[model samples]
Target: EVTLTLHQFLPAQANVPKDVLDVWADNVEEASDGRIEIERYPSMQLGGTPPELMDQAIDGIADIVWTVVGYTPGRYPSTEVFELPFMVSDARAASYAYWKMFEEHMKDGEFADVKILGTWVHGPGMFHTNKPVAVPSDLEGMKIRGGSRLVNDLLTRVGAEPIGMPVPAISEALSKGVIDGTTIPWEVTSALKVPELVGNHTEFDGPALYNLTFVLAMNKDAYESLPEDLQEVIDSQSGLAFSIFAGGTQADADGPARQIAVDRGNNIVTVSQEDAKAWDALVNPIYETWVAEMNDKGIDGQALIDEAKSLMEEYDPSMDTY
Candidate 1:
């Protein structure tokens, strides 16, 4: 029997780990006609910090791992396109675009060392704060934790002191006042107990404030060691299908968690489109900085940005069926 270990930073019961990754694993097992087994170890049970997940897979510390791409900044620089302020839509649309961008830009580049099963972003990155925040000016003089490099830069540009930490560290930070708020998706609020920790939430009316990228990666040698037919089984439930499903699943989860805040009578602030654009204007310089970095690396950043938006325009969130 072939057994693979799936390591992650969240508990077994967390939404993404439980609903998306495990479901994909089950599908792979059944599709392989019970020829394979996936042993899932959540909450970093395999050891090392969350940022080390890709290395863990590459070094064979784990056979497979799910991790946030932003954990290792400057490594996957192209992915910061998705992390740009107010650029992404709902989770499904953003993820489909991400898969497209990966195939077009990253397949033969930064990710070539590992066998990547899928890539996706969570629902729109927004704010869960101790107090109400609805505009860029409101974030002034506040400390907000950003999940990625571009996001941190955006936060900094908008006058918030950007604190960086993995998602699991957020609840404690909020409770301790180490951070006044954090940027994350509604999909994660329940797992991190954001509703209990913060009394306010802020959302953008049109595009998302930001989004962080994630990946399901595996050891290349482990993948290649499988027989050809078994390899096909792994392929059956991975790639575009997996990306769409995982992304859509995460977007779907946001509704229920948002209800938790609603039930708790928390202050949920929805920024008007006008205000969102105003906020966007403040941080648009991050895009220019990213473009220069891309050009410095000899890539056409403008072309990539155009392609990403084009892909996003074509995929319908409602039609994202796995």
Candidate 2:
């Protein structure tokens, strides 16, 4: 019998844990025909920080781990292509493209040490703040919590003060007035109680402001130690299909969380497509900076960006955000 342990940063009751990760575990267990059992450890119950998750999987501290690609910051630079401003509009499409890119670009390179079960990105990232934001200018001088290096750069480009922190720190930061706003997907608002803390929300009309990538990885040796039949069971339940499911499920969850803000009569600001173009224009240089940084590392960054965009277009031609 194979008993695998899954570790993640979210608490057990969070949307991603309850609806997505556990579903994968349940399916794997069922399909294994009682040959495998997965034990879940949420909120870092296995003893480590969120940024340590990928290393934990690599080091075999945890047999499996689901974590944000940005948590480690620039360790997997290619994945940042999806995180560029206004790049991802649909979680499902982005996730599909992410898996394709992982196979084409990263499977045996940056992520070679671990066996990846799935790769995905979250829903459209927007603003939750105490004050309403109708344009980029409105964000000037306001301190906003940013989840990654690229996001912080975006915030700085727009004149907003970027406070870097992990997702787990959002609630406390909002409560204590440490930040004026935070950039995150609507799906996480419920779990973090953002609506209860902030009365205003800012949304964009086209592609998302940004999105974070995710991966469910297993220790290589642990995977190899499995019997061939057990390996087949794991493979049958993961990969492209599971990635899509996880991404789609997260995006779907955004509606309910968004409704909570609506029920509370929070001020929801939707930037018109025309106005968003101005903001888009402001953030365009970030792509050049990223591409140049990648070029310095002897990587063809523009090619990566172009390919990621092309794949996303192939999956979601319309680039719908909702």
Candidate 3:
């Protein structure tokens, strides 16, 4: 039998691993008719930190991995197009649009080293705080953990101190008072036991505050070494549909996790519409900065921005935000 080890930072019971990754693994094993075996090591069990997952797949430390592309910061700048403040709505449109972008641009660029099984983004990332944060002013001088550089920038402009760290470290950080709050989605809050770690949950009413990009990547050598028939089985379960579903699972899981906080009597607040607009206005220049950086890289930033906007437009406008 051919064995592949899948490593990731989330606990196996987490939404992504339990629902998306395990399901994908199951399909692959079954389709291969017992020729394949998948070994999963969750919570970074196989080895290094969450930030190293991408390279682990590349260096053969793990045959496959799921990681946040932004964890390494600036490694995959184009993925930031989807993460522009308030640009991405729901996971479905953003994820599908992301996959389309990867097919057209990133396949030969930032993603060339590994065999990408799928790429996606989590659901709307919002503030889960130790105190109620109803407006930008409420965030003044607060130390908030940011999921990506752009997210840190967003928090910086909005009057908060931004601290960067991997998601696995958040619960400990929050408990230790290392951070005043965090920007993450409800889908992951349950796995992290975020409700017990913090007192308030703050979300934007209009669109996502920010979204982090994800990659389910396999080592190129590992994938190529598989028998052709096995490769075909793996291929059959990847791509557009799988990508969309992977992200959609996170979005779908938000409600249940949010309810967990609600039932716990934690303060769950949404940024008022007026405040949402004010917040949006505060981060517009970040987009310009992103474009400028892309241009420096010799890739047209404005073109990618417009393309992302256009692709998102092709999907259901009503399908955004929890």
Candidate 4:
């Protein structure tokens, strides 16, 4: 029997971990006829911070792991484009696009050290704060927990004091006054209990703020050690199909959690379409800055950005048609 340990920063109940990781694991195990076993270690049970997940897989500290590429900045700079402010519409579409783009552009030697099972982004991010945020000005002077450097940059650009921390640290940060609030999707609130931590849940009238990217990877040696047929089974169930399913599942799961906050009578405010547009316009510089920064790093940043958009549009025609 082949047993693999899967490590993650969040609890197994969290949407992505529950719907994506668990389902993927089950599928792979079933496909492999129970020859491949996946042991999950949630909430960093395997040890180390969230940013160390990739290294954990690479170094054989864990056989398989899931983490955000943005956790360790500059390491996966190209992937940051998907995390840019307002880059995603629906998580499902963006995820499909992300997987397609990664295979064509990023999956070669860029991430060759470890076997990448899948890559994807979350549903649109929203603001869950102590007070309601209707516009960019509302975020001014507020200390907000930023998920990644790109998120921090967007917060800083909008005049919010960006506090950097992993998602697990957010609840403590809020309770201890370390940050005024955080940026995350409704799907995560049940785990963090944002309804108990904050009174306000801010969402866009249209799509929301931005989404974060996540990667599921395995140790190359561990993956290669499997028999060729078993490896093929694992490969067949991974990559694009897994990524899109994960993204769609996360977004689908958000509805119930968001309803929880609504039932709790929290102030759930969806910014008006006009207001969302204004906020998007305000953050336009973030996109341009990212592209320019990537160019400076000898990458064809704009081309990649264009490709990402094209792929996104292909998956969701409304992005271009509407």
Q: What TM-score do all the candidates reach, one by one?
A: 0.97, 0.96, 0.96, 0.95
- TM-score (C-alpha) between model 3 and the true structure: 0.96
> Which regions of candidate 2 are displaced past 4 Å?
316-322
Model 1: lowest-lDDT 10 consecutive positions: 313-322
lDDT of 1: 0.88
**Cα RMSD for predicted model 1:** 1.3
Ranking by TM-score: 1, 3, 2, 4
Order candidates by lDDT, high to low. 2, 3, 1, 4
Number of colliding residue pairs in each model: 0, 0, 0, 0
| Per-residue accuracy of model 2 over 91-157 as CA lDDT, tens digit each | 8888889889999999999999999999998888899998989888999989999988999998999
lDDT tens readout by residue for model 1, 125-224: 7889888887778889999998788888988988999998988999889989999999988988999999999899998888887888899999999999
RMSD to true structure for each model, in Å: 1.3, 2.5, 2.5, 3.0
* Residue pairs of candidate 2 with colliding backbone atoms: none
Clashing pairs in 3: none
TM-score: the better of candidates 3 and 4: 3
lDDT of 1 at 143: 94
lDDT per model vs. reference? 0.88, 0.90, 0.88, 0.84
Q: Candidate 4: misplaced stretches above 4 Å?
A: 316-322
Worst 10 residues of 4 by lDDT: 313-322
Best prediction by TM-score:
1
Off by over 4 Å in 1: 316-319
